[PDB]
Amino acid sequence: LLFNKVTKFNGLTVLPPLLTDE
Amino acid sequence: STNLVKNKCVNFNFNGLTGTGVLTESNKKFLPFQQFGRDIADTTDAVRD
C-alpha cells in the first residue's frame, strides 16, 4: 500500500536504481 | 511521400510536425475533427496520416 499510495522521454533519463526495487 | 512501419523507431515529419519514435497501434477513441493528440507528458502522443 505504500507503493500504491505513491503515484518521460524529453531528453531526461531516469536511470534505474543500481539496487533494484525488489 | 512514403508509408510507415510499426515497432521500428523512425523519424516522422508530418507537415512540419517533427519527432522521433516508434509508430505503434492507437487504441483510444478520438473526436472526428482531431489532427493530432497529446499525452500527460506534453508530448505528441498520437498522429493521423
UniProtKB/Swiss-Prot annotation, chain B:
Self-association and partners: Binds to host ACE2. RBD also interacts with the N-linked glycan on 'Asn-90' of ACE2. Cleavage of S generates a polybasic C-terminal sequence on S1 that binds to host Neuropilin-1 (NRP1) and Neuropilin-2 (NRP2) receptors. Interacts with host integrin alpha-5/beta-1 (ITGA5:ITGB1) and with ACE2 in complex with integrin alpha-5/beta-1 (ITGA5:ITGB1). May interact via cytoplasmic c-terminus with M protein. May interact (via N-terminus) with host bilirubin and biliverdin, thereby preventing antibody binding to the SARS-CoV-2 spike NTD via an allosteric mechanism.
Entry function: Attaches the virion to the cell membrane by interacting with host receptor, initiating the infection. The major receptor is host ACE2. When S2/S2' has been cleaved, binding to the receptor triggers direct fusion at the cell membrane. When S2/S2' has not been cleaved, binding to the receptor results in internalization of the virus by endocytosis using host TFRC and GRM2 and leading to fusion of the virion membrane with the host endosomal membrane. Alternatively, may use NRP1/NRP2 and integrin as entry receptors.
Protein name (Swiss-Prot/TrEMBL): Spike protein S1
Residue window of the full protein shown: 530 to 578 of 1273
